[PDB]
Amino acid sequence: GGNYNYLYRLFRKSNLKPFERDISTEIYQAGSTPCNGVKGFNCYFPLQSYGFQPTYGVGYQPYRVVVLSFELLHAPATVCGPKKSTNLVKNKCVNFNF
Amino acid sequence: STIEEQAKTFLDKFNHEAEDLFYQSSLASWNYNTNITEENVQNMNNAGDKWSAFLKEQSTLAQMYPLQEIQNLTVKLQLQALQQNGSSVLSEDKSKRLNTILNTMSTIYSTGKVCNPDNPQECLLLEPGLNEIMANSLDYNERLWAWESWRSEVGKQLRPLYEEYVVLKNEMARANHYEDYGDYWRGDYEVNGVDGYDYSRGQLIEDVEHTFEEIKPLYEHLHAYVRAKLMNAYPSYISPIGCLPAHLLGDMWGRFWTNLYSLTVPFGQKPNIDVTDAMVDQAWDAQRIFKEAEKFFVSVGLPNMTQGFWENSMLTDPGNVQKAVCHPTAWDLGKGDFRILMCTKVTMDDFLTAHHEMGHIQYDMAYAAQPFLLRNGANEGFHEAVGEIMSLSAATPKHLKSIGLLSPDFQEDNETEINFLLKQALTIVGTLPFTYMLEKWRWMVFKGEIPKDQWMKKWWEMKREIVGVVEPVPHDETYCDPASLFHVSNDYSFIRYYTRTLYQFQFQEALCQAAKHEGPLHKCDISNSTEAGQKLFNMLRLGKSEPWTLALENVVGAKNMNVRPLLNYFEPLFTWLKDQNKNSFVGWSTDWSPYA
Q: Which amino acid is at B20?
A: D
User: DSSP labels for B462-496?
Assistant: HHHHHT-EE-SS---TT--GGGSSGGGSS---STH
Name, in order, each residue with C-beta under 8 angstroms of A51's C-beta and a sequence gap of 6 or more: A2, A3, A4, B20, B23, B335
Return d(Cα B453, Cα B116) in angstroms, integer. 31
Q: What is the resolution of this structure in A?
A: 2.8
- Reading phi first (left if > 0) and then psi (alpha if -120 to 50, else beta), residue B15 is in alpha
> Residue A52 forms beta bridges with which residues?
A3
Exposure string over B381-403, b if 16+ CB within 10 A, otherwise e: bbbbbbbbbbbbbbbbbebbbbe
**B449 Cα distance to chain centroid:** 27
Q: Map residue B341 onto helix, strand or coil.
A: strand
CA distances from A31 to B6, B57, B62, B74 (A): 6, 19, 15, 21
Burial of B487 (0-12, 13-18, 19+ CB in 10 A): middle
| Residues in A touching B28 (Cβ below 8 Å) | none
Return d(Cα B448, Cα B437) in angstroms, integer. 16
Q: Is B356 annotated as a binding residue?
A: yes
User: DSSP labels for B110-128?
Assistant: TT--EE-TTSTT-EE-SST
Name, in order, each residue with C-beta under 8 angstroms of B277's C-beta and a sequence gap of 6 or more: none
Return d(Cα B14, Cα B11) in angstroms, integer. 5
In this structure, the number of other CB atoms found within 10 A of the CB of residue B526 comes to 26
| Whether residue B465 lies in the annotated active site | no
- Reading phi first (left if > 0) and then psi (alpha if -120 to 50, else beta), residue B513 is in alpha
Nearest to B420 by CA among B400, B447, B446: B400
Question: Are A10 and B12 in contact (CB < 8 Å)?
Answer: yes
Alpha-carbon Rg of chain B, whole angstroms? 25
Name, in order, each residue with C-beta under 8 angstroms of A74's C-beta and a sequence gap of 6 or more: none
Q: Could you write out the three-class secondary structure of B62-89?
A: CCCCCCCCCCCHHHHHHHHHHCCCCCCC
Name, in order, each residue with C-beta under 8 angstroms of A90's C-beta and a sequence gap of 6 or more: none
Name, in order, each residue with C-beta under 8 angstroms of A96's C-beta and a sequence gap of 6 or more: none
Name, in order, each residue with C-beta under 8 angstroms of A33's C-beta and a sequence gap of 6 or more: A40, A41, A42, A43, B1
| Residues in B touching A41 (Cβ below 8 Å) | 64
B335 in contact with chain A, both atoms CB, cutoff 8 A: yes
Give helix B92-109 / helix B158-175 axis angle, nearest 10°. Answer: 140
Q: Are B271 and B419 in contact (CB under 8 A)?
A: no
CA distances from B158 to A68, B5, B168, B488, B536 (A): 72, 50, 15, 11, 44
Nearest to B332 by CA among B356, B313, B304, B351: B313
> Residue B191 forms beta bridges with which residues?
B199
Q: Is B569 annotated as a binding residue?
A: no
Return d(Cα B58, Cα B85) in angstroms, integer. 10
> Residue A29 forms beta bridges with which residues?
A43
| Whether residue B357 lies in the annotated active site | yes
Helix (DSSP H) and strand (DSSP E) numbers for chain A: 0, 4
Return d(Cα B36, Cα B95) in angstroms, integer. 32
Handedness of CA B460, B461, B462, B463 (dihedral sign): positive
In this structure, the number of other CB atoms found within 10 A of the CB of residue B34 comes to 19
Half-sphere exposure of A1 (CA within 13 A, CB side): 2
Half-sphere exposure of B591 (CA within 13 A, CB side): 2
Q: Are B358 and B476 in contact (CB under 8 A)?
A: no
Return d(Cα B497, Cα B208) in angstroms, integer. 12
Indicate the Cα dihedral angle B530, B389, B186, B460, nearest 10°.
Answer: 170
Return d(Cα B301, Cα B366) in angstroms, integer. 13
Nearest to B334 by CA among B543, B23, B33, B25: B23
Provide the H-helix boundaries in B301-366: 309-312, 348-366
Q: After which residues is chain A broken (C to N over 2.5 A)?
A: none
In this structure, the number of other CB atoms found within 10 A of the CB of residue B226 comes to 23
User: DSSP labels for B413-471?
Assistant: -HHHHHHHHHHHHTTTGGGHHHHHHHHHHHHHHHHT-S-SSSSHHHHHHHHHHHT-EE-
The catalytic residue among B190, B221, B355, B357 is B357
- A66: distance to nearest CA of chain B, Å? 25
What single-letter DSSP state applies at residue B279? H
Which of A39, A56, A61, A63 best probes binding to B when mutated, by most B CB atoms within 10 angstroms?
A56
Q: Map residue B253 onto helix, strand or coil.
A: coil
> What are phi and psi for residue B329, nearest 5 degrees?
-135, 155
Nearest residue in chain B measured CA to CA from A31: B1
Q: Measured over all CA atoms, what is the biggest interatomic distance in chain B, rounded to whole angstroms?
A: 80
Residues of A with CB under 8 A from a CB of B: 2, 10-11, 28, 30-33, 41-42, 44, 48, 51, 53, 55-60
Q: Which amino acid is at B123?
A: C
Q: Which amino acid is at B271?
A: P
Q: Is B328 annotated as a binding residue?
A: yes
Burial of B227 (0-12, 13-18, 19+ CB in 10 A): buried
Q: Is B463 annotated as a binding residue?
A: yes
Nearest residue in chain B measured CA to CA from A34: B1
**B433 Cα distance to chain centroid:** 15
CA distances from B164 to B158, B445, B504 (A): 11, 12, 37
CA distances from B333 to A78, B22, B330, B342, B546 (A): 53, 7, 9, 16, 23
Q: Which amino acid is at B334?
A: G
Q: Is B257 annotated as a binding residue?
A: no
Nearest to B312 by CA among B21, B35, B114: B35
Name, in order, each residue with C-beta under 8 angstroms of B367's C-beta and a sequence gap of 6 or more: B374, B375, B376, B377, B540, B541, B542, B543
Q: How was this structure determined?
A: cryo-EM
Q: Are B7 and B75 in contact (CB under 8 A)?
A: yes
Go through chain A and tell me how many residues it has. 98
Beta strand ranges found along B288-380 (DSSP E): 329-332, 338-341
Burial of B155 (0-12, 13-18, 19+ CB in 10 A): buried
Question: Are A57 and B306 in contact (CB < 8 Å)?
Answer: yes
Count of pairs with CB atoms under 8 A, one residue in A, one in B: 47
Pairing mode, if any, of strands B469-470 and B244-245? parallel
CA distances from B265 to B225, B239, B501, B584 (A): 10, 20, 23, 18
The catalytic residue among B142, B487, B517, B553 is B487
Nearest to B373 by CA among B82, B85, B49: B82
Return d(Cα B88, Cα B95) in angstroms, integer. 7
Pairing mode, if any, of strands B338-341 and B469-470? unpaired
> What are phi and psi for residue B95, nearest 5 degrees?
-65, -45
In this structure, the number of other CB atoms found within 10 A of the CB of residue A62 comes to 11
Exposure string over B78-109, b if 16+ CB within 10 A, otherwise e: bbeebeeeebeebeeeebeebeebbeebeeeb
Q: Which amino acid is at B525?
A: D
Return d(Cα B382, Cα B360) in angstroms, integer. 10
